[PDB]
Design a binder for this molecule. Sequence first.
Ligand SMILES: *[C@@H]1O[C@H](CO)[C@@H](O)[C@H](O)[C@H]1NC(C)=O
Ligand SMILES: *[C@@H]1O[C@H](CO)[C@@H](O)[C@H](O)[C@H]1NC(C)=O
Ligand SMILES: *[C@@H]1O[C@H](CO)[C@@H](O)[C@H](O)[C@H]1NC(C)=O
Lengths: 101, 101, 50, 50, 50, 101, 504, 504, 504
Amino acid sequence: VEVTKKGDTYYMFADKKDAGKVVTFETESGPNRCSIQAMDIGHMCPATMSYECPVLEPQYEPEDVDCWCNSTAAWIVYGTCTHKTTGETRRSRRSITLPSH
Amino acid sequence: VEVTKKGDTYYMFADKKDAGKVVTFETESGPNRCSIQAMDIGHMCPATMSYECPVLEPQYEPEDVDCWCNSTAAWIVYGTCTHKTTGETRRSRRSITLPSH
Amino acid sequence: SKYLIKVENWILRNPGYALVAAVIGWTLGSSRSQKIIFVTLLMLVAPAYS
Amino acid sequence: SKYLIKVENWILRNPGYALVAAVIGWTLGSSRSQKIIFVTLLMLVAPAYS
Amino acid sequence: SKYLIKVENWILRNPGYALVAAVIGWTLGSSRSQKIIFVTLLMLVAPAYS
Amino acid sequence: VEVTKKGDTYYMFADKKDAGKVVTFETESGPNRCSIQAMDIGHMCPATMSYECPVLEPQYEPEDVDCWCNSTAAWIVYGTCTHKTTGETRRSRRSITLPSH
Amino acid sequence: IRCIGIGNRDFIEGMSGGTWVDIVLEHGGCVTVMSNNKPTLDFELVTTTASNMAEVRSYCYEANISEMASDSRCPTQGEAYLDKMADSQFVCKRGYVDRGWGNGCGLFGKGSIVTCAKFTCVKKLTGKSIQPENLEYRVLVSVHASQHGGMINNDTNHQHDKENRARIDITASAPRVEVELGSFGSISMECEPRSGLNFGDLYYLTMNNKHWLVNRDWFHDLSLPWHTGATSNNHHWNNKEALVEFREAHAKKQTAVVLGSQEGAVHAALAGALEAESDGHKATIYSGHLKCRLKLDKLRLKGMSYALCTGAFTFARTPSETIHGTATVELQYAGEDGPCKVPIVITSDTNSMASTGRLITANPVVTESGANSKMMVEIDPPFGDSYIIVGTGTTKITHHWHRAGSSIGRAFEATMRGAKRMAVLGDTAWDFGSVGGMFNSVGKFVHQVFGSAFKALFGGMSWFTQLLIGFLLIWMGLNARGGTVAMSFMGIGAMLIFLATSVS
Amino acid sequence: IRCIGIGNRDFIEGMSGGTWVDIVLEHGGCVTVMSNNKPTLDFELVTTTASNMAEVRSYCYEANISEMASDSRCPTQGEAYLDKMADSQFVCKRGYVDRGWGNGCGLFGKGSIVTCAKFTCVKKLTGKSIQPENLEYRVLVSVHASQHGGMINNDTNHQHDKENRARIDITASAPRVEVELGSFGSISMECEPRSGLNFGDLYYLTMNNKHWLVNRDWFHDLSLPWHTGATSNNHHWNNKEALVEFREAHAKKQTAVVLGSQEGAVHAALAGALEAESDGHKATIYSGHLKCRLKLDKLRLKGMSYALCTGAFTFARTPSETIHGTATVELQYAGEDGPCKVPIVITSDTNSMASTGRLITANPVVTESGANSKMMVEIDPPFGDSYIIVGTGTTKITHHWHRAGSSIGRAFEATMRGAKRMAVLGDTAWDFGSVGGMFNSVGKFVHQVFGSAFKALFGGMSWFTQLLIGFLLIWMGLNARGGTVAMSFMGIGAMLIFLATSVS
Amino acid sequence: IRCIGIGNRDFIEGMSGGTWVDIVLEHGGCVTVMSNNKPTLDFELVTTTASNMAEVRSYCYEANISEMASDSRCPTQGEAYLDKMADSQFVCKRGYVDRGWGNGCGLFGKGSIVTCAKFTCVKKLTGKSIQPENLEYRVLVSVHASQHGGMINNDTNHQHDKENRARIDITASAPRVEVELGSFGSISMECEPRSGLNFGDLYYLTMNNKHWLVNRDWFHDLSLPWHTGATSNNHHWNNKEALVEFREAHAKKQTAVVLGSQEGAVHAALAGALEAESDGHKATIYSGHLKCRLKLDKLRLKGMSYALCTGAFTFARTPSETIHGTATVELQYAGEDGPCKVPIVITSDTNSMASTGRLITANPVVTESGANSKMMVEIDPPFGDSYIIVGTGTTKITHHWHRAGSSIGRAFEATMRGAKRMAVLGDTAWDFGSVGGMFNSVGKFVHQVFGSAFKALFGGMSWFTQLLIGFLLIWMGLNARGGTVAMSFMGIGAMLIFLATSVS
Ligand SMILES: *[C@@H]1O[C@H](CO)[C@@H](O)[C@H](O)[C@H]1NC(C)=O
Ligand SMILES: *[C@@H]1O[C@H](CO)[C@@H](O)[C@H](O)[C@H]1NC(C)=O
Ligand SMILES: *[C@@H]1O[C@H](CO)[C@@H](O)[C@H](O)[C@H]1NC(C)=O
């Protein structure tokens, strides 16, 4: 995965292939091993979900969290689409209804 | 993960640790490599979610599916609870109201 | 139907002679209904002279 | 209040003499209201002989 | 407007002679309205002697 | 961080840099390792938040506490302002309204 | 002495020869019954007891789930099937979901998905019904035996002489009870639990060791899982979907969730509800009145044959005054003469020495033979000023007393109260059976309605002048030829003759 | 000849000396105008054209999203913040989520989470308004010139002699138009687009190369994102949350989704809606009537001065009959005499030779000078049996014809139709301006309402007897002293005198 | 000359022998006072001055906090305590928070937590009261001395001859003032600041170098920290919790926050409020009228003894006309004759030479002895056309003038204005003390109410005919035996006799 810093904050460009594996990079504090448990991760495409995932102490189990590193809080970003067809999942099935007349 | 057969159907007892990894077992047809992408998987406890996940052709990529094997359709089962405290998530927040009097 | 239209067209073709015949036959009845029958008689015999 | 209860208890103690005095004073008035005043006079002077 | 103010100022300048003329013309009418017309006549001819 | 005692009670002057790290000092009982998990900690400035954080037994997990030492209860104090501009956050957004007339 | 400190206190007096007498007891008041030769009794109703209540319905506020399973079939396969559908303990829901090549099968259409899971009720509340045959009332009976009147005996462990107090349990099975007061005698009571609070539109709700009463027209309206009362280890439930919230169907599964504890919702809904208490399986209700009929045949006095007291009587404190114009006197006796009758009189002047009032406690007596003993009595002073004298000889003590109000006012108030009581006693007042008790019934109720005024009005209870007044009134009403003047006058005359024939 | 095969066909006849005449045109019918010396004209309204329509609002059924971002802060930190919040193209929502040690911070309290994403409208529909000054009507005018009547000239490319057909565009800017028919002459038309379909409560909806009309009170009721009424490449959308669905909640993020194509919902909702067609930016409406006034001053005949035909006339087929009782005759002429007048008569017997009916086509003539030519004419046969004779000499041909019905029935139907027409012509019927045209107006409309019955009833149109009947009726009404009998009789007499003064 | 360009201008004339005269001054108008032998004066009220205002209450819109501290105790420990609670500058709040083993102690219950912090007011606004003894009015007095009338002297620095203009400060302490006008003389003024704008329900609000006026019932309704006016460096505040917001609930602490600047809220709330201006600590109010009484005893003319002008008079421009029908004339004099009286007459024709109007400026004179000097005068021309003649001999100049309206209209308007003025002068109009001034008072006010019409109506002010008319009217009213005809006639006669006895 690509690791960059824009304005004193770390961005991790993770593609589809790196799904469910940890990665180690370097920060101003030192080495950082960060695990990624992204479930809705997709291929690379303009639709990009980005969310900060926070640092925590190893003496706690993750709860309702799919990203965690231990140097600081790290911002993760990844595309969300299907078979690189430039199309989102859009499976909402709301089926909004309109008045007849 | 544990692999058993009760009545000509294969059950895969998968715990929390084996989350996001594939597993290979044997069937009457031959070897079967089956991948598991369970996102809401929990620890081992009486609350057990079980659902059949189907066989599919290799060319067609999975879509909105978190379990797939290629010998036959395989029934997956795994617990769903928090920190092995014998307690379900029960996070519904419906807040049903009753008539006053 | 078959004869009413013919006599109607005949009346509308020459209404003067028809009205003359009608006013002649009006004063040749003993009762009102008898005068009506006499003028309808003239109305019916009007198309065919024979 | 202070005197009504006393005269009431006195009337209830010996009602015979009270009724005798009342019927005596009833026939000593010129008008009905005058008889009423005379009997209430007897009612009031009843507790204390003096 | 143009003439009312002039005759008004004339009346207000010498009211004695104006009242004399008014009381003279008041007694020279046969009816009340005729007297009113005669005095308004004097009122109108008052500014210009001619 | 600075550690002082004024009237048989310990004050820990912690600046912004020491945020999220433990510190060891000495008391009449012996060495004391005290952890600080202050999230809203700020720079040094007159606006100073001060609160006692209590001693507890190591066999229990903290439930709603961001400061814990094990010799006694220790009073922590730290500034709360932005970029050392001598200005408090004052982000209340109450927007109190007054009657017109 | 249990009837002294009660706000809602009545006074019932029966005929001299009349053994039977009817009364009404309210759950917040008391009744005092007195007679000429019988000792004063005090009846009170403490608590309404409900036991052996049947169960009607039970709800489950907090529940758990386990073993969630689902099955989906896409078009050209029919309806989905699961083996757990036929089981009554597993609840499932059906639905239709869009399918495609991404979900496993080829044809592009929507399929049928079904999802069920077990249902286990961890905590539940119950609803009971109340039948008239289950109710049981408790009435305490006290006797004015010149007791010390000390409130140190609260429970029923000791310090309660069995001849001075008693408890009675009135049940719907046997409404006839026989009360034994020891040396005083025995009485009979027949109570009819009627005209009480309606129990056909009330349900007894038990929840979390607490209890309430609810309306039947709301108990069935509640939207929660329920099941009727059937003795079994595993019960079948209905309408449990209201506690299990199903997540929107996914590509080929459905994850159900269970709601949390609904105790707060029930506590909020039951804010404006009535409460009660319970012991074990029995419940206690503090609302409901009762009608009773007492037969006083074998009841007698205890110290009628005793002698007089030749010792020293002294006041223990300033005599108090109650809201009903009654005066309690607490005496201390010095000397050793044994149980002796207490000579006490009420008059208007120290030299008059004439009884002007009555006593609420009949035959005041000392209970022990000790040197310095104590006793208490309750009397009713006449309106105005009066003197209470205790003892004889040169050692008799006197005390002044005053009471406001008017005799006519008290008479009218008592008459109105008696009229209200007779109106409450709608049924079971008279008897239309064998003849001979109809005149007895009309006399009994006219007495119970007019004696309070008869005693207060007609002079000093000479028993001789009143008969002459009645005779002259009957004569005046007889020698009158006019209508509507002889009937009423003769009726009033006969009423006065009968009221004078009774006890005054 | 464009008015032959039309179900809704009328007949309008004006005064002999009356140049002006008013008519009403319906979008589904036709109008035939005839006179004594003027050639028959046929007016039809083809399409209502709407152009240069302004745009009011556009909705977006199918949309896309991209660059979803979220930010979460737990308690004691305040509200979450994101730089994309200030941008108008990014929509976010706020919420509160439960946090704990498993999420990063310790204090247990609900935190503030915000989530926004871009919004791009991939497909949209538009709504336009219609103003009266934008409408433009198209009316075709045909002339009965004994044309061949062949339907081979459908479009406007060729095979349309410019002296036999014409098109007129009536606009709201200039309602006065001058029509040139070539050799026939010129006419004037003043049309007033009033009393049509209301266009103040209708919106023209364009969607997916299709078009509909909708109600204004319903167009604003639709729940979809919408912009302000201006032309901009990218406009600040409003109420876009209706197309972006957010998940329930998560301890650290929130994943939004976009709805699919809502084309099916709009197609289902617009089932009971009116439809139309469009070309480029112009729209075509098939509903709406029109009122017009025609001035026929320079209109003349074409073959009035021609000679007679001395050739051979022959029928081309059996003469057909239309729904309005009109007979079309298709003749073939042999010989070379040039354009000559067609001698045709309608009588009751072959020896009578007396005109009994009228002709819908005035001055039937042959158009070319060819050897074997063809022509067509349209006539109205009298009720009953009749004989049509064509030609003179020993070569004249005869044909039998029959027509059902009654003269009184047709007269009453035409009178009722004229009354309905005059009722439709509520406004702009008379003129209250300069004097001299008011009597002309009352005479004109009484003629247009009663001439159809006058011609059918009063004998053989002798023009001499009717005047005497009118005179005698006026005399009978004059010598009458009674009320309500002289006014009506004199009015009817004057009406008949005027109707006889006009053309019969 | 300060009263020329004023929209609200009045005219007050007193009795010939009447020294005292009452007037009313409005803050937006002027008053002109004229007499027979006294020079014309012009009074105006410039500004209401408020000084030495006391302070009532002060609010604090923007505040800061510092040194936030908290203390928590869990059950079985009692209430929390902090040393800063007893200090008045530290505000704390108490609460109950859930505790457990995670918070330090064992027992599972909720505890008591207290949290206080300092309070320092960085910015504040103030409220002052206004007392009648603090007000001070300023009135400028001008004298018509035939000044040049140039507006070049706006301020009070120079170009103001001290004998032609003056300023007077009317205070509530000493309402009696003596004004010195130099050579003209001295006057006395007694002004009573009554019937003005109420200052018992108004507060003077100072905020951010701006000032407003507010209602007392609204000033106390505001929900903000406040403190009364006490001279000190540190003040005690009340109800400061309205500016400090505490968080929900935390087990071990509570973080307070302070609100931002509330200047915008106050500016929005004070939108519909009145404004004013201030200099240093004094305030200026532009609303409020005044009543005054002038004593003119030592006031005389300046050029009464001067001679006539034997030079050349010329107009400097076309004479202007004001809204009150007054004509200003600007003259230029050539020659060196010293201060001489200006011979000017107003007539109807050049040969008549009869005074028909009056002069607003008494005794017009030239001020300097220069060769070519200038002067100004203000006169009132009669209704209609008139001729103004200036000078004598063969060098006198004439000018035409016209004025619209009617004498009766102006008379009625002046009568109504005088009636309104006398109605405003409710109190302090008459004197009920010593006798001899009551007739003077009734004559004075009947003059001030009717002289404007008396001068306009009753002829040419001959002073001889009017007496005869009054005598004959008195005689006509005397010889009349009927009621309601002699009293009114005698009253009108006496009124006319008195009005003729006064100055015309
Ligand atoms: C993060 O955790 C990993 C776990 O092995 C460790 O190797 C690494 O040094 C940690 N990073 C730090 C402490 O900065
Ligand atoms: C399933 O797929 C794996 C993919 O490598 C293959 O090795 C295995 O043989 C397959 N099993 C079958 C086709 O039964
Ligand atoms: C606090 O706990 C640490 C745990 O390593 C221990 O080393 C230290 O001595 C303790 N402090 C005391 C008991 O005062």
